[PDB]
Structure 1
């Protein structure tokens, strides 16, 4: 018409007191360029950066501040998304570098941990369906559809990979309590970032938990991403949980492809997930390890950072140790790196108990 739209800079957010990657990498020129662009489904830049805008963040804990709604979001708004990935994934370049996926689990070697040192071992990743929007942008119908696809695929599961599916909509109090006792049930998201991103709409509609009979295979349906798969065990046996995880993943992929649905996947980004931090693989191979003597030493965080491992709470000297680079390295490579780090910390703790000096690994 003849009326004038608001200038692109008139919609520019106030990012003076923000400390997330979105605010750091957002410039007036990029916002002006990407204000008009829109994904085929309907996701806009403002909806992409709403989580970063509403949450200023805090120093010493830097977040991404961005979410995605579709596969096209990483392409329509690629100009802003690429530097965020660059800074979040230690310099990984989506412009030219190509991600490699290796989920065979036939390359895992050794990696058996001491039972006293390691109490539990987990392998966790996420997946999303290609034809349906991401949790920030998915409507109620699409959230029902992803649940239906996952339930239909997981119904045809046999062998040790056998279990049931519980819907939070009609979850009874007794089974809810037993799931809480098993530390498998997920609550309504309360983090301000998730709520601002729109990952808690329509709760608990279309949200479900798929539980294996052996209590080793866990599936969360559209709580933070379309599917969150976990293979866990009480002990230090990473090879068995890794092979169970890969068998379940390939079985689910084959079943959904047989039904006609396909996982989100791109050559340059890997497995597409809603949060740009979890990209490529989404793997967090964690370990609940108790190393009091090593935790006493102040050089322990530096040594952990040298091998690209991070520590988090479960404290009683028991911590969860997980890898860093979700994107840019193969899944089996990530598993090998995390088991190597765990073994290095195990022998360091053995030396500390014996009093032997520990050599710092190269960064």
Structure 2
């Protein structure tokens, strides 16, 4: 009968009295009640959006957004809650008002060769989603396999230095996977609290893989946390070369993907659409491992990092803790700035941190 009553929205309201994520900070009964009936065309709902944040009040060693997107329409359907979260997460960028700009030209990255005695590694990463296919939080098995096929067929066309091979996760022995992970190449096993709580570990390891070139300097993760993750690595401090290779490889990958009639999720308001709102815009993370000695001598690190808009994760893995003083330092914000700007910002911040190696002098300037 239509006379039966539904549970009022406040009855479903989550208990966030001890949570410490942006979703919990920006979620109110009014917003929840307003959005609790809406749904994206593929069936994504607000509860599925905020489940990861509800289940994870903490999650060291960083501040978590606590939300994910199930498809492209999510960011538009639930904008009333995503917009404040995006604005807070990206230090003031306002998706409602301003637009995002992207340029990939390493030529404007003049300089950018770190001290080889302090870095030991440099990486540049981005993510990409295929339009028309649900994101990992919501994708079914068929959609995930479709993403894998599209990406593999497109990547088969890479030639020259970028020429490489695809390795299916389900077809590689445990020893090979462990070796790849320990070498910082392959993505870790599905143990991240966000990955599990959001539902991105379903059907593991089906349809996940890694496509890498022979030198293993160019890599592409398929179906780990985004549809694709394009990575350029180098065991050194030559961020300039890493970024140049990353730019050319990304351009080639985009061209080959678009050749087959597939286009990437993208809108000028948000840039490139990805699952975590923290990866919107460029989705670019340019970072470096940093030397164990000397940087072990820092005391007021968090304030300096926050003022430089740099995020510090432990050694390999955001879910891990720094061992021996080695830190993965990268940019914090990815939306509102272009890739060249973000890479230059990372270079400047890391150079500032290096200059702050006061093993011979004293005093830190912080220098907001």
Q: Is the 8 A contact 1:167 1:209 kept in 2?
A: yes
Uncovered stretches (5+) of structure 2, i.e. residues with no partner:
316-322
Give the TM-score taking structure 1 as reference length. Answer: 0.92
Go from structure 1 to structure 2 and tell me whether the alpha carbon gap of 1:49 and 1:237 turns closer, same or farther (over 3 Å shift): same
SS at match of 2:250: helix
Task: Name the stretch that deviates more: 307-316 or 145-154.
Answer: 307-316
Mapped to 1, the partners of 2:230 and 2:352 lie a distance apart of 27
Task: Name the stretch that deviates more: 220-229 or 175-184.
Answer: 175-184
Uncovered stretches (5+) of structure 1, i.e. residues with no partner:
none
Go from structure 1 to structure 2 and tell me whether the alpha carbon gap of 1:259 and 1:20 turns closer, same or farther (over 3 Å shift): same
Q: State the Cα RMSD in Å.
A: 2.4
CA apart distance, 1:312: 2.5
Mapped to 2, the partners of 1:189 and 1:58 lie a distance apart of 15
Mapped to 2, the partners of 1:28 and 1:83 lie a distance apart of 15
CA apart distance, 1:354: 11
Go from structure 1 to structure 2 and tell me whether the alpha carbon gap of 1:299 and 1:192 turns closer, same or farther (over 3 Å shift): closer
Q: Is the 8 A contact 1:322 1:338 kept in 2?
A: yes
- 2:262 maps to what in 1? 261
Q: Is the 8 A contact 2:22 2:85 kept in 1?
A: yes
CA apart distance, 1:17: 2.4
Deviation per CA, 1:143-163, whole angstroms, max 9, x where unpaired?
001111110111000111011
Q: Is the 8 A contact 1:264 1:272 kept in 2?
A: yes
Mapped to 2, the partners of 1:47 and 1:346 lie a distance apart of 43
CA apart distance, 1:226: 0.8
Mapped to 2, the partners of 1:347 and 1:4 lie a distance apart of 65
CA apart distance, 1:355: 11
Mapped to 2, the partners of 1:40 and 1:16 lie a distance apart of 32
CA apart distance, 1:19: 2.0
Mapped to 2, the partners of 1:46 and 1:206 lie a distance apart of 26
SS at match of 2:279: coil
Deviation per CA, 1:183-235, whole angstroms, max 9, x where unpaired?
32334311233211001001111000111101101111111111111101111
Q: Is the 8 A contact 2:278 2:333 kept in 1?
A: no
Q: Is the 8 A contact 2:104 2:339 kept in 1?
A: yes
Go from structure 1 to structure 2 and tell me whether the alpha carbon gap of 1:345 and 1:28 turns closer, same or farther (over 3 Å shift): closer
Go from structure 1 to structure 2 and tell me whether the alpha carbon gap of 1:67 and 1:177 turns closer, same or farther (over 3 Å shift): closer
Mapped to 1, the partners of 2:48 and 2:69 lie a distance apart of 9
4+ long deviations beyond 6 Å: 353-360
Mapped to 1, the partners of 2:330 and 2:48 lie a distance apart of 31
Deviation per CA, 1:9-58, whole angstroms, max 9, x where unpaired?
22212222222211221111111111111111110111111111222226
1:288 matched to 2:296? The reply is no
Q: Is the 8 A contact 1:100 1:270 kept in 2?
A: yes
Question: How many equivalent pairs are there?
Answer: 360
Q: Is the 8 A contact 1:312 1:319 kept in 2?
A: yes
SS at match of 2:342: helix
CA apart distance, 1:182: 3.4
Give the TM-score taking structure 2 as reference length. Answer: 0.91
CA apart distance, 1:181: 5.2
Q: Is the 8 A contact 2:52 2:194 kept in 1?
A: yes
Go from structure 1 to structure 2 and tell me whether the alpha carbon gap of 1:58 and 1:144 turns closer, same or farther (over 3 Å shift): closer
1:327 matched to 2:328? The reply is no
